[PDB]
Amino acid sequence: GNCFSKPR
């Protein structure tokens, strides 16, 4: 995981 993500 290199970039940030959140649940949509």
Add this chain to the structure above:
Amino acid sequence: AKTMEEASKRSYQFWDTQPVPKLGEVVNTHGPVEPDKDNIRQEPYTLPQGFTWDALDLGDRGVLKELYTLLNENYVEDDDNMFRFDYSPEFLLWALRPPGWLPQWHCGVRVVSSRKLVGFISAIPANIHIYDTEKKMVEINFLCVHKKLRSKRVAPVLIREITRRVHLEGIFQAVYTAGVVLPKPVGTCRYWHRSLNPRKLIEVKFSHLSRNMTMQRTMKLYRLPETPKTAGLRPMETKDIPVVHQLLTRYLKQFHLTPVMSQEEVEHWFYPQENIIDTFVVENANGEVTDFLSFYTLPSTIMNHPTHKSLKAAYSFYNVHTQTPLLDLMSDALVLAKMKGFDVFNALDLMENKTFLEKLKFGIGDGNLQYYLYNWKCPSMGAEKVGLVLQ
């Protein structure tokens, strides 16, 4: 640019100078963009006035703390500026000193007066197998610039110097992952998220209570068993390195963008390190290791919250299966992550992951991760064919 067809309106003043395919062109060939360099420039590029390059020795507790402080305050944040990554100093050593690392590839930018550290870019050696070619490359990671120094040309200076550092060692290709959209991704991967502790994620606004749902049902929907169900599952140790290597090597041959690891590299990336990398293997009744799973730990700092500070997360690494289904393997990984105190379990849709994602209550996330190849023209692939995981 975060979505791909918003990049189409842009123009790239720096990425139109670099040997990368154009965002519009289709690629039908497999080869380099430019010839390997006969002579390599000997002088480092000119940093703006009052700044000088350095080479951080991470064997120094003081210098590593500088690197942690630089990244902890200035690294990647979410789109709404709520969370910032919190790489451990012990994590950085794990990902910046694999077999073959070089000190001049830990490039730092300092201020002459303060001697403060305001920038960083990294490079580690990696043998990458892309389609039918096996190339000695480097992985570029931890591209960071101080917040006060942003938007003033310093990022393209970091890329040209680190390229010059690696060109001096005979390597002319590279691989790297980023969230922004640049020319030109060989693959795009979506993040998915599985909530182990849904109470904390809702309080910190990581996720929202779904349509027509109470917290009690959501607390009871994402609950997990106490102990793993797979027989003979145990942590990895020294005696498991050769077979774990052998399992991963054959398993990867089906994908098109994978690494090629020696037995020393397999031991480095997979041998259990507490709070950095967790590996578990499956040993059957005949004493044979037939499967293994792995996840690494990367928390992020929760911002502007008076009571909640950190967000502990586990990231799916490599999971090879031969006699145990991938569904049971990943289910026990969630349980193993639940036992260790994780709040969430993130995983990409690369490889065969799309088979277990929906069934194991993973939620589809907002962010995209792009894979890039420097100085290698090759046709872009689908996410189901990517077999490369970076930190």
